[PDB]
Design a protein around this ligand. Structure first.
Ligand SMILES: Nc1ccnc2c(Cl)cccc12
Lengths: 39, 156
C-alpha cells in the first residue's frame, strides 16, 4: 500500500547547481515503454 | 488528504523500512507520476485515497483523481531544471541544457543527470516554472551514466 508525502513547491530557483551535458542519441521505444540505444 | 499543488515522494512499506519508489506532481487536483513507479496501483494521502484515472505503459505515465494536466513543452533552446527529489534527501533544483532522443517517431528532450531510481517522477521545469515533463524513463550510454527523456503527457 503506497502513500505520498509532500517534498516541496514547483519553482525555478535562480542560481541553482548548473551541471550535466547535452548529448544527441538515436533511440528505439518498445511496446513495453523501455528505451534502448539504436546504434 | 493533501491535495496541495507541488512535488511528492511515493513511498511503500512492502519492503524493509519505508522505501521511496518514485516522485510525482500534484496540480489542479491531479497527481501525475511515471507508470513504472506505482504499476497503476492506488495511493494513500492521509486517510485520503488516490485512484488511477488515466495511464499508458508505452508513454510510461499515469494520473490519479483526473486527466493528465501538464501541457507545457521544452522550447528546444532554453536550459531547464530537474527538481530532483532523491530518497532520504531534500528536494534540490539542478539546472541543465537538454540533449535529444532521436527516434523514428521524432525528437524528444533528454536530460543527462544521474540519480537513484527512486527519483523517477521528479519534474522538469521551464523558466516560467511550468512542468514540461518527468524524469526517470530513458537509457544508459557508453560511460555507464543514465540519460532520461523529458516524458510529457497529452492534455485534453
Ligand atoms: N538503472 C536505472 C533504471 C531506471 N531508472 C534509473 C534512474 Cl531514474 C536513475 C539511474 C539509474 C536508473
Amino acid at each position: 500500500d503506497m502513500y505520498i508525502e509532500r517534498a516541496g513547491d514547483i519553482t525555478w530557483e535562480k542560481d541553482a547547481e548548473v551541471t550535466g551535458n547535452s548529448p544527441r542519441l538515436d533511440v528505439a521505444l518498445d511496446e513495453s515503454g523501455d528505451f534502448s540505444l539504436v546504434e | 488528504g493533501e491535495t496541495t499543488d507541488g512535488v511528492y515522494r511515493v513511498m511503500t512499506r512492502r519492503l524493509l523500512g519505508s522505501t521511496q519508489v518514485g516522485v510525482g506532481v500534484m496540480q489542479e487536483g491531479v497527481f501525475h507520476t511515471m507508470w513504472h513507479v506505482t504499476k497503476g496501483a492506488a495511493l494513500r494521502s492521509g486517510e485520503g485515497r488516490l485512484d488511477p484515472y488515466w495511464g499508458d505503459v508505452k508513454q510510461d505515465l499515469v494520473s490519479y483523481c483526473g486527466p493528465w494536466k501538464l501541457d507545457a513543452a521544452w522550447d528546444g533552446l532554453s536550459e531547464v531544471q530537474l527538481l530532483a527529489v532523491p530518497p532520504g534527501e531534500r528536494a534540490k533544483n539542478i539546472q541543465t541544457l537538454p540533449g535529444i532522443f532521436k527516434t523514428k517517431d521524432g525528437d524528444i528532450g533528454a536530460v543527462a543527470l544521474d540519480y537513484p531510481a527512486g527519483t523517477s517522477g521528479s519534474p522538469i521545469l521551464d523558466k516560467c516554472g511550468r512542468v514540461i515533463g518527468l524524469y526517470g524513463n530513458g537509457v544508459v550510454i557508453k560511460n555507464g551514466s543514465y540519460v532520461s527523456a523529458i516524458t510529457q503527457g497529452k492534455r485534453e
